[PDB]
């Protein structure tokens, strides 16, 4: 059957840094718009999989650079923060909650 969401309360923990994340919150969002095409199929697997983004070098900007492909913009999928940017828009509070680097809804 197509696949379900799993419960809210997710912890991204590759990092120091650990994030949560709730797919409550982003039912607005396609589900292929992060379990991305690869090979043409929408894949499933944990972002940090090896031979996906699995290097930890946050300073890598080529694809498999998961802090590049957590934060940055122009990707050819959009970012948490990417996406976050263009939600929040000229609002600086959601500004602050949605892409604040520190004391925001990602690293409280
Ligand atoms: C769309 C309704 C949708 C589905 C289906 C889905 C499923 C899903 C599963 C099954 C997991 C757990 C994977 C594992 O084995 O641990 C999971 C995890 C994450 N998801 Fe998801 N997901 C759906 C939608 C979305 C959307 C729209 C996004 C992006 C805004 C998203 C993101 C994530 C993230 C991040 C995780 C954790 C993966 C990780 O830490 O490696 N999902 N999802
Ligand atoms: C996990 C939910 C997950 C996220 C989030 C994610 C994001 C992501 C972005 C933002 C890009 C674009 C980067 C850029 O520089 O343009 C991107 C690109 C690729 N990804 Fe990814 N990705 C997630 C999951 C996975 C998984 C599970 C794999 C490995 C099976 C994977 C792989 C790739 C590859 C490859 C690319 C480059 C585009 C292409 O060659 O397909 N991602 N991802
Ligand atoms: C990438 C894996 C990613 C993370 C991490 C993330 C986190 C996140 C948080 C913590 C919130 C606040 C709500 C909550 O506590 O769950 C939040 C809210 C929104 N997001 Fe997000 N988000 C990630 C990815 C994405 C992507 C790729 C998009 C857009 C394509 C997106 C969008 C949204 C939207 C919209 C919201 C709600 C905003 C509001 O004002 O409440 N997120 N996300
Ligand atoms: C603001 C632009 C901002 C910064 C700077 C930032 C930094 C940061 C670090 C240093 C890490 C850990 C990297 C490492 O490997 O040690 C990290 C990790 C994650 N972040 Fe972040 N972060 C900033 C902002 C945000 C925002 C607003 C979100 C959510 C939209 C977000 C998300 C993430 C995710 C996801 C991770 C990985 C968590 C994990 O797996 O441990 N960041 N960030």
Same mark, same amino acid.
């Given at each position: 059957?197509?696949?379900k969401?799993?419960?809210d309360?997710?912890?991204?923990?590759?990092?120091k840094?650990?994030?949560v994340?709730?797919?409550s919150?982003?039912?607005?969002?396609?589900?292929?718009?992060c379990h991305?095409?690869?090979?043409?199929?929408?894949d499933?697997?944990?972002?940090? $999989? *090896? /031979?996906?983004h699995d290097?930890?070098? &946050?300073?890598?900007k080529?694809? @498999? %650079?998961?802090?590049?492909?957590?934060?940055?913009?122009?990707?050819?999928?959009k970012?948490?923060?990417?996406?976050?940017?263009? $939600? *929040? /828009?000229?609002?600086?509070?959601?500004? &602050?909650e949605?892409?604040?680097? @520190? %004391?925001?809804?990602?690293?409280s």
């Amino acid at each position: 059957a197509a696949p379900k969401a799993p419960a809210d309360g997710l912890k991204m923990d590759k990092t120091k840094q650990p994030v949560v994340f709730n797919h409550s919150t982003h039912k607005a969002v396609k589900c292929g718009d992060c379990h991305h095409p690869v090979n043409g199929k929408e894949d499933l697997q944990k972002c940090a $999989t *090896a /031979g996906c983004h699995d290097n930890m070098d &946050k300073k890598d900007k080529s694809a @498999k %650079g998961y802090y590049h492909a957590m934060h940055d913009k122009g990707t050819k999928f959009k970012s948490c923060v990417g996406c976050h940017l263009e $939600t *929040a /828009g000229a609002d600086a509070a959601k500004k &602050k909650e949605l892409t604040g680097c @520190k %004391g925001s809804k990602c690293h409280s």
